[PDB]
Structures are given as C-alpha cells and as structure tokens.
Design a protein around this ligand. Structure first.
Ligand SMILES: CNc1nc(NC2CCN(Cc3ccc4c(cc(C#N)n4C[C@H](C)N4CCN(S(C)(=O)=O)CC4)c3C)CC2)c2cc(CC(F)(F)F)sc2n1
Length: 467
C-alpha cells in the first residue's frame, strides 16, 4: 505494498468514511481492487456475519486492513513467479492467467457450501479460504492487478464470470467453475459458448470490465443479508451510497444490472433528489440496448419485478413480453438452466398469481383491469411466443406439458370478447415469430378455450390416449 496516500483516511469509522475511501481510490490511476474488497469484506463480516459487540460501525483500523492486504500479496507473490512468464509486448500470457487461477483455486478449503452468503470477497478468501464462483474470478483479477498485469480484466455474463487479457484485451480465459456438476474448463476460451448462441455467453455481448466496472462489481457483490428475514440497514446504505458514487462518476454506464440493483435500493429507501426507480430501470434497459445489442434478459426482469410488486399487471406483462423477445434469438443450451428457471417461475407461478388477484378484483368491479385490456392479452401471447421461438433450433427443449396447464389457465383469465380484439397478423395487432404460436392462433378466441388442443400445440405432442 500500500502507498502512503492510500493510508491517510484510516481508520474508517463510518459508512461515509468507507465512501470516502472508494472516492479516493476511484480518483487514482487504477483503484486498488484488493484494498477495496478487503475493506468491504471486513465491514460485511462485522455487520452481517457476526454483529456481537456492534454499537455503530465496525471500525476498520489500518493495522488490521494492512495485515490482511499483506497476507494476500505475500501469497500471490510467493506462488506466482513472473520470471517464468515473460510479458511479451507488456501484456499477459494464457499460461500466466492459468497460473494465477490455479493459485487461487488451490488455496480454497477442500469442502464447503459454495452457495453460502458472504464468501464473495477477499476477506472471505483470506480469513476463511472460501470463495463463491464469481468470487474466484474477481480474486484472479485482483491478484493480477497486484502483480502489475494491467491487461487482465473481469468479464461478466448474466450467470458467469471469466477474464479477458492479452493483445488488445482480445483473449478470453475461464478462471472459475460454473454451476454444479459441470466440468471445469479453466484455461480455455469462451468461443464455443459464444458460437453456440447460449444465454450463458450472451452471443459475445458480455461485459468487458475496466477497473472502475470491477469496483462496481464488488459493490453489487455486497450481501446485506443477516438471515432469511433480516437485512443489515448499514450494508444496504453502504451499497446504495457506493452505487450513487459510481453512477455520478459514469461507471454504471455500461453495467445494466447495477442500475437495476440501484433502482431496487431506491424503491426500498428513496434518496431525496435522485431519479425514481422506474427511471433507473429504464436506464438499465437503455444501457443494454446501447452497449450490448439489447441481448440481456435481466434489465427487463428487474423492471418486471418492480411492476409485479406494485401489482401493475399491465406493465409487468409488457416487461416480461420484452424479456421473451430477447430470449427468442438464443439457443437453449446445457448450462443455461438459471434463465430457464426464471422463465418457468414467471410463467407457472408469478403470472398465475397476479392474474388470480386481478380476476378477484375484476369481480369486485375494478376499472381499467389488465384482464379487460386486449393489449395485455397481446403481451401474454408475446411472452409465450418468445419462449417458443427460443426453443426452435435449440439442442435441448424448453416446453413440456407441465407448462400447458398454466397457459390454458392464464388464457382463460381473459374473457373471449377481450381475446377476440387482438389481430394476429402474418409476415391491437401482434405478429408471431414462433411456429408453435402461429398454429395456436385459431384456438385463442373461443369463448371456452380448447384445453386439449392447446396442450397438443404447445408440446407438439403427437397423440391422445388410446383408450
Ligand atoms: C447487480 N449486479 C449484478 N447482478 C447480478 N445478478 C443479479 C440478477 C438479479 N437477481 C435478483 C432477481 C432474481 C429474479 C428475478 C428478479 C426480477 C424478477 C422478475 N420478474 N425475477 C424473477 C423471479 C421469478 N421473481 C419474480 C417476482 N418477484 S417479485 C415478488 O419481486 O415481484 C421476485 C422475483 C431479480 C431482480 C440478483 C442477482 C450479476 C451476475 C453476474 C454474473 C456472475 F457470474 F458474476 F455472477 S454479474 C452481476 N452483477
């Protein structure tokens, strides 16, 4: 190592002192990822993992943080001999990146629950020898910065992390695991995943972080959870203030999910004089459109969740239809199961519950109901259309009969006279991209929907029961 100028704000006695440290580091040529992650991990430990003795804020003394920092830089410098890996042209080699990955990996405890909270930071790595999946990727990047490897940067999809490096930053390397019961690909490129058009690799439209975005990542990685029913107000405030600092400096520009996180925090506890949650959700979508070809799913997911919490059925349906319009141009691959799970839960649990309450409210005489709005029926249809189109061409199927009962129920929440008002046009008006929905068209306006025919069309089931 730490330089004199990095040390002058210690001790950190409050949330605002932590914010000052982040501001000072963000003003430097390269913010120190190791320092910053150790500080966050330290305060998260004493605010969420063990609050014994807490009276206000866990003071972070320089002696304590500097000793943790020294434990990290000693391990890395001792285990990675840079002379074995000459930096050709002032950039890093694949072998060096895989060395650093191995040093982090091999340090980890032999057995632990990888799903646990509060194992994301370098504090966890040093004091518990535990990291979560993306935590390992972050740690590799922090280690490379500590070694002077300016070209190694964090790469992020919506469900995975790796690194970029090398000439023009054009190389990719896996540095951590993905999911459970997948085989390690550490050291390899991500090109096969890009080429197969999986969601996991975002068709190549993944985030390539600079150092400031790596700071944003560790701030998003703060976990305020104390338990299933309790969050640390202190950590919520810290994360919120840090995200506003990053926002003001321009470092959330290219980070859609961070904008959604900030919107969620503002919904919980609004900051006076700041943009409303909707504004922020829409900025997150705009970031995805601008920098990532509109190939990201979660910006719409964050927006839909806000509308669903506020029981705004219309706008929730629109955002989930928009969700589906992105997924339709992907192939559903091995290792995409997390996004399948989210679409499944929206289709088969969230939408049904939202429409069930809308039906009860309509019975009690609600006006302007989504259930009497043909544009809302069109959004529901567009949601299913995008899921059906996603499945086309995919190496693994999406739909099955366990989806069909919920489709029939949801369709039936709209009366036939509402459903009749949507005009399905071929290449309120809607065009279908999927063959499954094109063949379902003439079932969609009957007063009583033909449940059996819908199931056949959605699952492309060939036959009915013999007897
Ligand atoms: C912030 N930066 C960041 N975040 C990353 N991942 C986050 C992505 C969002 N999730 C929270 C989450 C989860 C599910 C969500 C939603 C929103 C919806 C909807 N609809 N849905 C669907 C589910 C079914 N429901 C619907 C109903 N709502 S409700 C009751 O509130 O109405 C609850 C959620 C959200 C916000 C948190 C984690 C990642 C991931 C990265 C990759 C890697 F590898 F690094 F980890 S980087 C990153 N950055």
């Amino acid at each position: 190592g730490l330089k004199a100028a990095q040390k002058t704000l210690f001790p950190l006695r409050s949330i605002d002192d932590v914010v000052r440290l982040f501001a000072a580091e963000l003003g430097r040529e390269e913010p120190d990822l190791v320092l910053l992650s150790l500080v966050l991990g330290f305060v998260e430990h004493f605010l969420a993992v063990n609050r014994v003795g807490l009276t206000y804020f866990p003071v972070a003394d320089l002696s304590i943080i500097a000793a943790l920092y020294a434990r990290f830089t000693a391990q890395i410098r001792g285990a990675v001999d840079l002379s074995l890996y000459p930096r050709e042209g002032g950039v890093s080699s694949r072998e060096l990146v895989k060395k650093v990955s191995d040093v982090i990996w091999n340090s980890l405890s032999r057995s632990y629950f990888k799903d646990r909270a509060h194992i994301q930071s370098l504090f966890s790595f040093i004091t518990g020898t535990k990291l979560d999946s993306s935590g390992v990727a972050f740690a590799v990047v922090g280690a490379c910065q500590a070694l002077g490897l300016r070209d190694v940067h964090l790469a992020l999809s919506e469900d995975h992390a790796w690194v970029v490096f090398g000439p023009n930053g054009e190389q990719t390397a896996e540095v951590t695991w993905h999911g459970k019961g997948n085989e390690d690909r550490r050291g390899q490129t991500v090109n096969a995943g890009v080429a197969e058009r999986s969601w996991l690799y975002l068709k190549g439209s993944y985030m390539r972080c600079d150092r400031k975005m790596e700071v944003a990542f560790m701030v998003c990685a703060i976990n305020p959870s104390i338990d299933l029913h309790t969050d640390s107000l202190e950590l919520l405030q810290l994360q919120q203030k840090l995200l506003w600092l990053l926002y003001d400096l321009g470092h959330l520009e290219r980070y859609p999910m961070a904008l959604g996180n900030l919107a969620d925090l503002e919904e919980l506890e609004p900051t006076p004089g700041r943009p409303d949650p909707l504004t922020l959700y829409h900025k997150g979508i705009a970031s995805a459109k601008t920098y990532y070809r509109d190939e990201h799913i979660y910006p719409y997911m964050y927006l839909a969740g806000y509308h669903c919490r506020n029981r705004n059925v219309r706008e929730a349906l629109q955002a989930w239809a928009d969700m589906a319009t992105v997924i339709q141009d992907y192939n559903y691959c091995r290792e995409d199961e997390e996004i399948y799970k989210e679409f499944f839960e929206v289709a088969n649990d969230v939408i049904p519950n939202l429409l069930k309450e809308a039906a009860s409210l309509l019975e009690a005489g609600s006006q302007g109901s989504a259930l009497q709005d043909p544009e809302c029926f069109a959004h529901l249809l567009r949601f299913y259309d995008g899921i059906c189109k996603w499945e086309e061409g995919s190496p693994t199927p999406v739909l099955h009969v366990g989806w069909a009962t919920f489709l029939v129920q949801s369709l039936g929440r709209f009366e036939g006279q509402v459903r009749q008002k949507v005009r399905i046009v071929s290449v309120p008006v809607l065009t279908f991209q999927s063959e499954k929905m094109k063949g379902m068209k003439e079932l969609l306006v009957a007063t009583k929907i033909n449940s059996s025919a819908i199931k056949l069309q959605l699952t492309a089931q060939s036959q009915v029961q013999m007897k």
